Structures are given as C-alpha cells and as structure tokens.
C-alpha cells in the first residue's frame, strides 16, 4: 500500500499498467504516501 486517494483517503496500492484511480470511489488523483526511510538532518 503505497498510495493514498485524495478524496476518500484510502491507502491503496497501484499495480503495473493499472487504472490510476481509487477503488472505493472513482477519484483520479493519488497521493504518494511517505514510507519509513532514513532522512538525515542537522538540527540548525
């Protein structure tokens, strides 16, 4: 589950050559969610 619907906020996954839409409602905008990864900052 890597993507979030912009309308109903359902965490979905989008396979290859797949229709870019949410399954719970036909909304055509998807938000790429933030997956757990190391990001480094200097606290200044």
């Amino acid at each position: 589950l890597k993507y979030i619907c912009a309308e109903c906020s359902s965490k979905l996954s989008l396979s290859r050559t797949d229709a870019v839409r949410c399954k719970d409602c036909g909304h055509r905008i998807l938000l790429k969610a933030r997956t757990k990864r190391l990001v480094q900052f200097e606290a200044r």
């Binding site: 979030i4 912009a6 109903c8 906020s9 359902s10 938000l31």
Partner: protein, 69 residues
C-alpha cells in the same frame, strides 16, 4: 505556526508556556498582562512571544489526507 521554543532575543524557554497561558485566560479569568507575569515572563522580549503568538498550526491540522472526513 506552532509556539516558538526558546524566544529570539534572550533565549528563555517559552515553548512550554502556551498551553499554560490559554488555561490562565479561559478558566482563571485573567487579563493578558497578569497571566504573562504569573508564568514568569518579565522581560518584554519574553512577553511579546506568548502574547503575540497566533497558533496557526490548529488551522493547518484540519487538512488531514491520512483520514476519512
């Protein structure tokens, strides 16, 4: 946006005094000058932080794309 830790002109820790300030204006009906004096904010650089903070993060947080609405 959210309350500034460590006020800009001297360095007094100020960020732990926002929720104590709204408590001392709503339940205890004080004016803004008595409440800044009860929290220990004496210097007028320290006073204009909690006095003039807008707390705009409470308006940002109502746009949550990670939850149904």
């Amino acid at each position: 946006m959210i309350v500034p830790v460590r006020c800009f002109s001297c360095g007094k820790v100020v960020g732990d005094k926002w929720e104590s300030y709204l408590n001392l204006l709503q339940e205890d009906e004080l004016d803004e000058g008595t409440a800044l004096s009860r929290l220990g904010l004496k210097r007028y650089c320290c006073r204009r932080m909690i006095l003039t903070h807008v707390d705009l993060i409470e308006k940002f947080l109502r746009y949550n794309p990670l939850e149904k609405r």
